[PDB]
From a paper:
Mucin 16 (MUC16) overexpression is linked with cancer progression, metastasis, and therapy resistance in high grade serous ovarian cancer and other malignancies. The cleavage of MUC16 forms independent bimodular fragments, the shed tandem repeat sequence which circulates as a protein bearing the ovarian cancer biomarker (CA125) and a proximal membrane-bound component which is critical in MUC16 oncogenic behavior. A humanized, high affinity antibody targeting the proximal ectodomain represents a potential therapeutic agent against MUC16 with lower antigenic potential and restricted human tissue expression. We describe the crystal structures of a single chain h4H11-scFv and describe its interaction with MUC16ecto composed of 26 residues (31thLQNFTLDRSSVLVDGYSPNRNEPLTG6th; numbering from TM) to understand the binding mechanism through the comparison of the apo and the MUC16ecto-bound scFv at 2.36 Å and 2.47 Å resolutions, respectively.
The short MUC16ecto domain, composed of 26 peptides was fused with a MBP to facilitate its stability and crystallization. The complexes were crystallized at pH 5.0, which is a physiologically relevant pH inside an endosome or in an hypoxic tumor environment. A complete structure of the complex was built except for two regions; the linker domain composed of Gly-Ser repeats and the C-terminal 7 residues (RNEPLTG) of MUC16ecto sequences, that have no visible electron density probably due to high structural flexibility. A structural view of MUC16ecto revealed that it is composed of two consecutive β-turns of 31stL∼F28th and 27thT∼R24th residues and a β-hairpin of 9 residues. The β-hairpin is a simple motif that consists of two β-strands, oriented in an antiparallel direction (the N-terminus of one sheet is adjacent to the C-terminus of the next). It could be stabilized by two inter-hydrogen bonds between V19th (-N) – Y16th (-O) at 2.8 Å distance and V19th (-O) – Y16th (-N) at 3.1 Å distance, respectively. To our knowledge, this structure of MUC16ecto, composed of 19 residues is released as the first human MUC16 structure and the first retained ectodomain for any tethered mucin. We observed a dramatic conformational differences including reduced interactions and a new hydrogen bond between Q115 of VH and S197 of VL at the interface area between VH-VL during ligand MUC16ecto binding. In particular, the sidechain of VL S180 was moved ∼ 2.5 Å, forming hydrogen bonds with Y16th and G17th of MUC16 (pink highlight). Y108 (VH) underwent a significant 3.3 Å shift towards MUC16, leading to the disruption of previous hydrogen bonds with VL residues (T182, Q243, and S245). Three water molecules (w1-w3) contribute 5 pairs of hydrogen bonds through bridging D106 and Y108, and S180 with the MUC16 ectodomain.
Author numbering:
A (entry chain D): 149 to 384
B (entry chain A): 0 to 389
């Protein structure tokens, strides 16, 4: 119900240039209670899972170099790299968390001169078939965290699929998969699952399990650790 | 999202006497026409808050009181309304266990504590102390038996040894739990758990041991002692091992200190039958005949209802339960107990399995139990139109 645009869709810079990336939403993302803006920023470097950069619009995640900088208010958000570097070649995603979860379409940026999560269980299926992806968690109190499934589809398409609360009472699915998919967890075996049935060929993607982060100041409403994507191909 | 009016659906654990409870149900039906359905979902202690969050689930939920603070803060529980007259039928300390923010949130049923259960034929004089068990196993190994086998996968069973010498969960000071005073790290805790691990290192126990391994071990007469609650008695009864129930061994001269659980009945907040539930609980279950129907299926042990406890406590096994109960501490029900259990469960399993030292395992459990500012229980990490669900 919330749409996000990111401009520009791609971008080529020489090393050292200062870079600003836009994100605009169909509506205000401000949390009337925490006064935080429900927007987060992610970096997906080629061959890797996305990582958390910014959450609450302007708060940098631990470990993120300070040349990365998030700003913005209302419906208008910006990620700035003050002086870009070689290691920053990546697609950058804004993600809203004001009403469920939506990833923006992404900005491809090119340069010209013990918390562990392991997925398993992807594969091929005919259209209308089934598969159950899993994700084994270690290095943290899994019982205490909400977990989410996010998938990456061939055309730079990062999509939220489902989220399940730390104790399982609260579950939410993307429209794209509602009814057909079922997210479950087993807090006893430290495990998360996505049963995928009535598969469309558009469901072909790398599927990531991701931990929803929180801390002493409140929920991040962002995913701070990701597994490597298990792959699901629906081939006619 | 619909519980269905004009019907009672009850959830209770599988080791308790659900068929007995179901016949209290049928009595309720012929008197009032209301159908009563008893189910025993697996892991119902987690199934309940999971389905009740969106307003589904049973009308009545049974568990030890410890989890009920947690359910109540999550709003999954109705405030119960027994008048003073019914309240007096039950022991006052059991009502204290069903309080949360001054409010009564469940009906107490039974008072549970682990006892030492021994094979009388293999071992006529059971050990007063934990210390003499290693040598008692060597003897018993000579005749192809072991001395002790109990559940190590559930910290509930290992807690009595940990607390014997001063291990504690949260400190209870001036009428309140202080969730920044955690004792899973102290010297008493370490002394107990080290002793349990040494038991495993010296081939007297297996880290491997779980409930059903230890049960069959005892009921097949292969181990001289087990540690269990009154629920376990009926399987021991049918097996006809000649068994006794008695005081838990001392550790370092101190009694083992089981966490006492008050088995309780909660009414779902989302239930449309809250009056029918009150009536069933007050007028049918919590009667001498009510509790006996359940008890004859699977023993409840000691019960919160005075009139029936006075009958039950005549049984030396219930006397033992009470004695052990009196030497332990009533569990807290504060929401953080969930975090704690997970924490200690991990510590006990990792220390016992070797993957961690006792000092490392308990330090972790203490970290994971301490700074729980506003521990949540069911963290959704999602907003819906800018607001959290529930």
């Amino acid at each position: 119900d919330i749409e996000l645009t990111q401009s520009p869709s791609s971008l080529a810079v020489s090393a050292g240039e200062r870079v600003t990336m836009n994100c605009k939403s169909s509506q205000s993302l401000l949390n009337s209670r925490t006064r935080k803006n429900q927007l987060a920023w992610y970096q997906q470097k080629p061959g890797q899972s996305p990582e958390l950069l910014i959450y609450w619009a302007s708060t940098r995640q631990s470990g993120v170099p300070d040349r990365f900088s998030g700003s913005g208010s209302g419906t208008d958000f910006t990620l700035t790299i003050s002086s870009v570097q070689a290691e920053d070649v990546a697609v950058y995603y804004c993600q809203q968390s004001y009403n469920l979860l939506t990833f923006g379409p992404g900005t491809k940026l090119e340069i010209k001169r013990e918390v562990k999560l392991q997925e398993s269980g992807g594969g091929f299926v005919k259209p209308g078939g089934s598969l159950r992806v899993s994700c084994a968690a270690s290095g943290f109190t899994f019982s205490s965290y909400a977990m989410s499934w996010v998938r990456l589809a061939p055309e730079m398409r990062l999509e939220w699929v489902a989220t399940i609360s730390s104790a399982g009472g609260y579950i939410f699915y993307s429209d794209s998969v509602q009814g057909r998919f079922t997210i479950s967890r087993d807090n006893a075996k430290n495990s998360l699952h996505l049963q995928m049935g009535s598969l469309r060929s558009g469901d072909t993607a790398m599927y990531y399990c991701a931990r929803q982060g929180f801390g002493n100041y409140g929920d991040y409403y962002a995913m701070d650790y990701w597994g490597q994507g298990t792959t699901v191909t629906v081939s006619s | 999202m619909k519980i269905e009016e004009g019907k009672l659906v009850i959830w209770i654990n599988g080791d308790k006497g659900y068929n007995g409870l179901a016949e209290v149900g049928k009595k309720f039906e012929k008197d009032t026409g209301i159908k009563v359905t008893v189910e025993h979902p697996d892991k119902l202690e987690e199934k309940f808050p999971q389905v009740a969050a969106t307003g589904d689930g049973p009308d009545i939920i049974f568990w030890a009181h410890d989890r009920f603070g947690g359910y109540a803060q999550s709003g999954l529980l109705a405030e119960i309304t027994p008048d003073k007259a019914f309240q007096d039928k039950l022991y006052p300390f059991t009502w204290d266990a069903v309080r949360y923010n001054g409010k009564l949130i469940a009906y107490p049923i039974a008072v549970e504590a682990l006892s030492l259960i021994y094979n009388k034929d293999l071992l006529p004089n059971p050990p007063k102390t934990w210390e003499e068990i290693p040598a008692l196993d060597k003897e018993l190994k000579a005749k192809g038996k072991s001395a002790l086998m109990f559940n190590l996968q559930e910290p509930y069973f290992t807690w009595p040894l940990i607390a014997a010498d001063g291990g504690y969960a949260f400190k209870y000071e001036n009428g309140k739990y202080d969730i920044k005073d955690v004792g899973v790290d102290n010297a008493g805790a370490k002394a107990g758990l080290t002793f349990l691990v040494d038991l495993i290192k010296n081939k007297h126990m297996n880290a491997d041991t779980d409930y059903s391994i230890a049960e069959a071990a005892f009921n097949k007469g292969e181990t001289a002692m087990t540690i269990n609650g009154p629920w376990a008695w009926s399987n021991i009864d049918t097996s006809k091992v000649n068994y006794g129930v008695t005081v838990l061994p001392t550790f370092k001269g101190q009694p083992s200190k089981p966490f006492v659980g008050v088995l309780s009945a909660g009414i779902n907040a989302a239930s449309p039958n809250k009056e029918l539930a009150k009536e069933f609980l007050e007028n049918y279950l919590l009667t001498d005949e009510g509790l006996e129907a359940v008890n004859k299926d699977k023993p409840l042990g000691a019960v919160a209802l005075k009139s029936y406890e006075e009958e039950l406590v005549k049984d030396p096994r219930i006397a033992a339960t009470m004695e052990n109960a009196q030497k332990g501490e009533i569990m807290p029900n504060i929401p953080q107990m969930s975090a704690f259990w997970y924490a200690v469960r991990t510590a006990v399993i990792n220390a016992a399995s070797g993957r961690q030292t006792v000092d490392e395992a308990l330090k972790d459990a203490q970290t994971n139990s301490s700074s729980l500012q506003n521990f949540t229980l069911d963290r959704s990490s999602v907003l819906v139109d800018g607001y959290s669900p529930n």
